[PDB]
Amino acid sequence: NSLALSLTADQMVSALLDAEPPILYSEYDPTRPFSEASMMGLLTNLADRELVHMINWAKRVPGFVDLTLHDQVHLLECAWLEILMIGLVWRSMEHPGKLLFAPNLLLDRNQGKCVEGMVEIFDMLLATSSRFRMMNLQGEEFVCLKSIILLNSGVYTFSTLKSLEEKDHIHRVLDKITDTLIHLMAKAGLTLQQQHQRLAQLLLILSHIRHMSNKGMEHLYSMKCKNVVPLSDLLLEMLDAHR
């Protein structure tokens, strides 16, 4: 059958929590005032190493390995910047007004003006972090939201008659993660009305996270033509998947 549809709510939380990739470090040197092109190199180098952990994290997500290789490639190509962004927003939650790209790389809004076009995307990331802070987002809810982004950001972008069965199994996992979130909120002493409201508030942020990824993805393609960022072979194949 499948290993995801058999997991319970608490076992779902355990698996996702156990699957969490580590928080990588950056080669940032505070003694060197990094310019726009150098600050881009740090984020490109960091995101390149994060993709490798994300790819192996997606394997640990329940149900993801129960899909074809072409489906796995599709979902990640569509959601990689979304998953990076929501991870960044999560790490920055207790650093108001700053984005914790790495434990040694904490950036300010003014430092985002360094790179041209980054200001608007920095402000959206900051506001998303502000939203998680107001909601007091729990880690068990974050890991659910992150694996939802993985299965949802490419499920309507496939489809033939044979591949239609794969679409239905993804929603069965999606519905399972939705039960898990509700299980979490009920455990935290929330009424039914409160659980439905918070469940909606979380999934609406995913609309904004998609907006940031899209606007961000559009910005990444321009710099490839601008040729200001250093080298990154996997990010080029990921960026061209949206082109």
Binding site: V52, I55, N56, K59, L69, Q72, L234, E237, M238
Partner: peptide, 10 residues
Amino acid sequence: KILHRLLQDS
């Protein structure tokens, strides 16, 4: 496709 290989590793 690098994403294919990394998904197929081990």
